[PDB]
């Protein structure tokens, strides 16, 4: 009887992850993500809120960093992740796990500074790839630490 609207979420908690369903939605939930290794997100957690449209899985899910996350395709006030970049990696048969396990460390490992939510980013990440670095690394420390959600 069952729709991946109503089960997907559990492949993120088979494959270790620690999320909350919002208002025992299955289609509302916010998810502990961390940091990929070796990029200037290295160390930080954010809780990510993702919630499944009504035509998932053919529609993308939307996903918002609720902590501060500096990157071009991120909206910096919401923390929105561009719903076009989204798109050009999910198709109806891309898993809900490898958003997390893959497309997510990719984006934040590879920007694109090409239609910007945040364009202050795609500019200092532009100008000086090293500065712009520098810049997530203590936006990083300061916004996404350890303790922040406890």
Same mark, same amino acid.
């Given at each position: %009887?069952?729709?991946?609207?109503?089960? !997907?979420?559990?492949? &993120? =908690?088979?494959?270790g992850y620690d999320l909350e369903l919002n208002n025992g939605s299955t289609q509302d939930f916010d998810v502990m993500f961390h940091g990929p290794n070796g990029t200037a997100y290295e #160390? #930080? =957690?954010?809780?990510?809120? /993702?919630? @499944?449209?009504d035509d998932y899985p053919?529609? %993308?899910?939307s996903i918002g960093f609720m902590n501060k996350l500096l990157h071009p395709n991120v909206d910096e006030a919401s923390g929105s /992740?561009? &719903? !076009? /970049?989204?798109?050009?990696?999910?198709?109806? @048969?891309?898993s809900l796990v490898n958003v997390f396990e893959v497309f997510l460390p990719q984006? &934040?490992?590879?920007?694109?500074? %090409?239609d910007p939510l945040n364009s202050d980013a795609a500019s200092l990440l532009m100008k000086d790839k090293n500065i712009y670095e520098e810049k997530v690394k203590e936006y990083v420390k300061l916004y996404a630490s350890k303790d922040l959600w406890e």
């Open positions: %009887s069952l729709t991946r609207k109503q089960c !997907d979420f559990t492949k &993120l =908690i088979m494959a #160390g #930080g =957690i954010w809780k990510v809120h /993702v919630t @499944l449209p053919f529609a %993308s899910p /992740v561009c &719903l !076009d /970049v989204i798109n050009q990696t999910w198709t109806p @048969l891309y984006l &934040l490992t590879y920007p694109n500074p %090409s």
